[PDB]
Amino acid sequence: DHEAHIKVLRGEPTPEEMAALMAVLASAGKERNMWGHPVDKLRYSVFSWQRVTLLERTHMRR
Amino acid sequence: DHEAHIKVLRGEPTPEEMAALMAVLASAGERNMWGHPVDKLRYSVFSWQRVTLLERTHMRR
Incomplete structure (x- = not known):
């Protein structure tokens, strides 16, 4: 795997925050x-x- | 003189015959x-x- 992935460098979103983040970015x-x-x-x-x-x-x- | 001249290869005309020849050719x-x-x-x-x-x-x- 050598695709450039999204990195969350700082903090730790809980699963629901992850899903909101990803859905807005998509x-x-x-x-x-x-x-x-x-x-x-x-x-x-x-x-x-x-x-x-x-x-x-x-x-x-x- | 390196110009290419006419040349009467054979016979001789008299001057009057030469004058006729040259007038005709000219x-x-x-x-x-x-x-x-x-x-x-x-x-x-x-x-x-x-x-x-x-x-x-x-x-x-």
Whole structure:
């Protein structure tokens, strides 16, 4: 077991206080669509390395 | 003189025949890349032809 458990560091709640505490704590708390992605709206020089390191990288990263 | 001249390989004309020959022979003798096909091709985002065709067209002079 290596989950990060809740710790009560100080004091000792009796069972009913434990249950009230836990119940209140329990109460509170990738579809790609590149269409018109900003990187497509940018305008790149024909020899711009950003065509590799920004545009293509952004499209390919999945 | 290293210019390439005409050459009468065979026979000799008289000067009048040479004048006729030369008169007859003499009397017989910007980039706009807009819509270049390479822009019209559809490329994969990773297609190497984006380098070796498209840039090698737009940049080339």
